[PDB]
Amino acid sequence: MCGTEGPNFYVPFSNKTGVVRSPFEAPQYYLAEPWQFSMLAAYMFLLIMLGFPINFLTLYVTVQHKKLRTPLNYILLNLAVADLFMVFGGFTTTLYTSLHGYFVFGPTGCNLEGFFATLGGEIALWSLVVLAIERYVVVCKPMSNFRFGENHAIMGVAFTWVMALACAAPPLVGWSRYIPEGMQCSCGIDYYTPHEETNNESFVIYMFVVHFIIPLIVIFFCYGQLVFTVKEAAAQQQESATTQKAEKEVTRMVIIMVIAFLICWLPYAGVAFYIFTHQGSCFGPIFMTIPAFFAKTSAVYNPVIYIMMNKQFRNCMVTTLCCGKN
Amino acid sequence: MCGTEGPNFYVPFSNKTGVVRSPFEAPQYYLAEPWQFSMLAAYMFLLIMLGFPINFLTLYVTVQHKKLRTPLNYILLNLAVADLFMVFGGFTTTLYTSLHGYFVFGPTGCNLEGFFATLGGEIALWSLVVLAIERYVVVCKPMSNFRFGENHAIMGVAFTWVMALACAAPPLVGWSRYIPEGMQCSCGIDYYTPHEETNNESFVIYMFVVHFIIPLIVIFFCYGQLVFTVKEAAAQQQESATTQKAEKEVTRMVIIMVIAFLICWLPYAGVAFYIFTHQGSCFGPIFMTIPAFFAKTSAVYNPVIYIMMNKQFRNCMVTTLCCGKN
Numbered sequence: 001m002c003g004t005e006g007p008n009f010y011v012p013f014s015n016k017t018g019v020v021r022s023p024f025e026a027p028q029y030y031l032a033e034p035w036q037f038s039m040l041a042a043y044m045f046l047l048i049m050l051g052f053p054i055n056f057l058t059l060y061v062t063v064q065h066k067k068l069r070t071p072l073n074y075i076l077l078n079l080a081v082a083d084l085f086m087v088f089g090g091f092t093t094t095l096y097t098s099l100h101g102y103f104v105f106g107p108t109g110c111n112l113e114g115f116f117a118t119l120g121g122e123i124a125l126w127s128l129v130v131l132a133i134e135r136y137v138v139v140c141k142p143m144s145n146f147r148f149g150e151n152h153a154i155m156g157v158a159f160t161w162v163m164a165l166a167c168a169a170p171p172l173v174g175w176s177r178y179i180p181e182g183m184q185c186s187c188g189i190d191y192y193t194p195h196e197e198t199n200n201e202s203f204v205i206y207m208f209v210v211h212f213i214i215p216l217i218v219i220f221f222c223y224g225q226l227v228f229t230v231k232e233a234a235a236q237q238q239e240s241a242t243t244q245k246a247e248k249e250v251t252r253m254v255i256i257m258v259i260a261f262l263i264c265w266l267p268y269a270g271v272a273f274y275i276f277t278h279q280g281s282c283f284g285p286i287f288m289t290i291p292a293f294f295a296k297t298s299a300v301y302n303p304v305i306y307i308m309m310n311k312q313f314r315n316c317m318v319t320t321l322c323c324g325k326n
Numbered sequence: 327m328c329g330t331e332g333p334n335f336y337v338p339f340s341n342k343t344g345v346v347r348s349p350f351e352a353p354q355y356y357l358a359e360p361w362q363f364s365m366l367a368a369y370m371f372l373l374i375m376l377g378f379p380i381n382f383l384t385l386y387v388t389v390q391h392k393k394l395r396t397p398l399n400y401i402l403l404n405l406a407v408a409d410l411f412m413v414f415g416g417f418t419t420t421l422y423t424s425l426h427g428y429f430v431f432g433p434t435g436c437n438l439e440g441f442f443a444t445l446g447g448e449i450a451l452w453s454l455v456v457l458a459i460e461r462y463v464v465v466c467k468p469m470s471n472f473r474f475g476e477n478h479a480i481m482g483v484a485f486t487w488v489m490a491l492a493c494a495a496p497p498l499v500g501w502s503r504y505i506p507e508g509m510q511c512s513c514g515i516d517y518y519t520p521h522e523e524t525n526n527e528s529f530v531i532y533m534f535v536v537h538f539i540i541p542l543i544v545i546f547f548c549y550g551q552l553v554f555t556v557k558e559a560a561a562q563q564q565e566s567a568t569t570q571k572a573e574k575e576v577t578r579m580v581i582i583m584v585i586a587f588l589i590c591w592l593p594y595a596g597v598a599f600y601i602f603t604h605q606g607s608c609f610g611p612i613f614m615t616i617p618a619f620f621a622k623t624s625a626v627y628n629p630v631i632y633i634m635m636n637k638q639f640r641n642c643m644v645t646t647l648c649c650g651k652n
C-alpha cells in the first residue's frame with residue numbers, strides 16, 4: 001500500500017516491508033535519514049531562540065510606552081501574544097519531538113503542537129481582516145464620525161481569538177482531530193484519514209470555508225479599495241499631505257502583512273488541500289513537512305515587518321533598549 | 327514629454343519631434359511599423375471569420391432543439407448573443423480601423439468599439455456569477471426545493487445585461503469615456519487622462535470595484551464550495567452516481583470557464599491598472615495593445631469550451647449540421 005493507517009496516525013511509507021512503527025510508540029527514522037530529523041530540531045531550535053525575544057520585546061515596548069495606543073499597536077501587540085503561545089505552547093513541544101524522531105508525550109502532546117499552530121495561524125489570518133476593515137474605514141472612509149475608539153479596537157482584538165478558536169478547538173474535543181503530518185513531528189488537522197467518529201470531512205471544509213475563503217473575501221474586498229483613495233476619493237475628501245504619509249505608511253505595512261501571509265501560509269495549504277481530495281495517492285514524508293515547518297514561521301516575521309516598516313514603533317523600541325533615548 | 331495629450335485622445339509617443347497626429351484626424355503609422363498595423367487587421371479579421379459561425383451556430387443549435395432548456399443552455403446561448411454584438415458591433419468597427427492605421431468614423435465610432443467590448447466582457451463576467459451561484463445551489467444544495475424553473479434562469483440572464491450595462495453605458499453618456507488605447511486601434515475606458523468633466527477617476531474605480539472585485543468574490547466563494555460536496559457533503563446528502571457524472575460534467579466546465587476568464591481578461595487589467603495609478607510614466611504603444619487585442623478573444627472561446635466539454639450540447643450540434651442524426 002501507500003501509507004500505513006493506524007488507530008490515530010497516518011504515514012507516507014509502505015508497511016510492505018513491515019517496518020512502520022506508530023508515531024506515538026517508537027522512532028520514525030525509517031522515513032527520512034537520521035541526519036535530517038536533527039535538521040528539523042535545529043531549525044525549530046532557531047525559531048525558538050528568535051521568536052521568544054522579538055515578540056516578548058514587542059509585547060513589552062507597548063505595555064510600557066503610552067503614545068502607543070491605536071488600532072495598529074493593538075493588533076501587532078496581539079500577535080505579540082498569539083505567537084509566544086506558538087513558541088512555548090507549540091515549538092517547545094515540537095523541537096523536543098524531532099530530537100527523538102517521533103512524538104513521546106503521547107498523543108497528549110500532538111494536541112499542543114497542532115493546536116498552538118492552528119491557533120497562532122488563525123489569530124493571524126483574522127487579525128488581518130480587522131486590519132483591512134480598519135484600513136478600509138480609514139483609507140476610503142465611509143459615513144459619520146464614529147471614529148475608531150480604543151474601544152472598537154478591543155472589539156476586534158477579542159474578535160480574533162474567538163474566531164481563531166472556532167477553527168482550533170473544535171478538533172480538540174472531537175470535530176476532526178490533530179494527527180501527525182509528513183514526518184510525524186508536526187501535527188495538523190486530519191486532512192489524511194476519512195474517519196467517521198469526528199465527521200472529519202465536515203470540520204475540514206468548515207475550517208477551510210470560514211477560516212480561509214471568507215477571512216480573505218473580506219481582506220481582498222478591502223484591498224483594492226486601499227487604492228481608490230490613495231488617488232481621487234481623497235482629492236475630494238480633502239486629506240492634508242501631513243497625513244497621507246503616515247496613514248499611507250500604514251496602508252503600505254498592512255499591504256505587506258497580507259502578501260507576507262500568502263507567501264508563508266498558502267504553501268502548507270497547497271498540500272493540505274491536494275491531500276484531502278486526492279486521498280489514497282502515494283506521496284512521501286516531505287510532501288507536507290516543508291510547507292508545514294516552513295509556514296511555521298508565522299510567529300516570527302510580523303513583529304519584524306513592524307520594526308522595519310513602522311518608524312514610530314521603531315523609534316520607541318530603540319529607546320527602550322538603549323535606555324533613555326537613542 | 328512621454329505621451330501627447332489632446333482634446334479626446336492620449337498616446338505613448340513624444341511630440342518632442344512634433345510628429346504626433348490625433349487618432350481621429352490622420353494615421354498613427356508613427357507608433358509602430360506599417361507591417362504591424364496590418365497584423366492587427368489580419369488577427370481582427372480571423373476572429374471575425376471565426377466568431378461569426380461558432381456563435382451564430384450555438385445561437386441556433388438551441389433555438390431549434392427542445393431538450394436544450396436548462397440554466398446552462400441559457401447562459402451559453404446568452405454568450406451566443408453578447409459575443410455576436412462584439413463582432414458586428416465592435417470588431418467590424420475595429421478591423422476596419424487598423425487597415426487605416428487610425429480611427430476614421432470620428433470618435434462616433436470609438437464608442438461602438440470601446441462599448442461593444444466592455445459590454446461583451448461584462449456579460450461574460452456576470453454570467454459567470456449566475457453560473458457559480460447556480461453550481462453552488464446544485465453542488466452543495468441549501469434547503470427546501472424551490473429548484474429553479476426555466477424562470478429564475480431568465481431572472482439571472484436578464485440580470486447579466488443589466489449589470490453589464492452599469493459598466494459600459496455610463497462612460498457613453500459622460501461618466502468616464504471611451505478613448506484610444508495603445509496603438510489607437512482599440513478603445514477602452516479612459517484609464518489614461520485625469521480629466522474632470524466626467525469624474526474619470528470615480529467611474530474607473532467604480533467599474534473596477536463592482537465589475538471586477540465583487541463579481542469575483544461571488545465566484546471565488548462558490549468555487550471551493552464546488553468541492554465540499556464533490557466529496558462528503560454528498561455522501562450524507564445521498565447522490566446517485568448516474569448524476570455525479572453529468573452534474574459534475576458541469577461542475578468541471580463551469581470550473582474551466584472561470585480559469586479561462588482569468589487567463590484571457592486578467593492581462594488587459596494588469597496594464598489598465600498599472601496605467602491608472604502610475605499615470606505619467608513613459609510606456610509604448612504595445613504595453614496596452616497586446617492585452618487588449620489578446621483579451622479580445624472573449625467572444626470566441628466559450629462556445630468552444632462548450633462543444634468540447636459538454637456532450638449533450640455536442641451530440642445535438644453535430645446532429646444539426648449532419649442533418650438527421652450523426
Ligand SMILES: *C/C=C(C)/C=C\C=C(C)\C=C\C1=C(C)CCCC1(C)C
Pocket residue numbers: 113114117118119120121122125186187188189207208211212265268269272292293295296
Ligand atoms: C507546524 C505545524 C503546523 C503549521 C500545523 C497545523 C496547521 C494548521 C491546522 C493550519 C491551518 C491553517 C491556517 C492557520 C491558515 C490558512 C489555512 C489553514 C487551514 C492551512
Ligand SMILES: *C/C=C(C)/C=C\C=C(C)\C=C\C1=C(C)CCCC1(C)C
Pocket residue numbers: 439440443444445446447448451512513514515533534537538591594595598618619621622
Ligand atoms: C479590444 C478592446 C477592448 C477589450 C477594450 C476595452 C475593454 C474594457 C473597458 C474592459 C473592461 C473589463 C472587463 C470587460 C472585464 C475585467 C475588468 C475590465 C475593467 C478590465
Ligand SMILES: *[C@@H]1O[C@H](CO)[C@@H](O)[C@H](O)[C@H]1NC(C)=O
Pocket residue numbers: 004006015018019020021022
Ligand atoms: C504492519 O504495521 C502494523 C501497525 O503499524 C504492525 O503492528 C504490524 O506488526 C506490521 N505488519 C506485520 C505483518 O507485522
Ligand SMILES: *[C@@H]1O[C@H](CO)[C@@H](O)[C@H](O)[C@H]1NC(C)=O
Pocket residue numbers: 330332341344345346347348
Ligand atoms: C504637437 O502635437 C499637436 C497636436 O497633437 C500639433 O497640433 C502640433 O502642431 C505639434 N507641435 C507643433 C509645434 O506643431
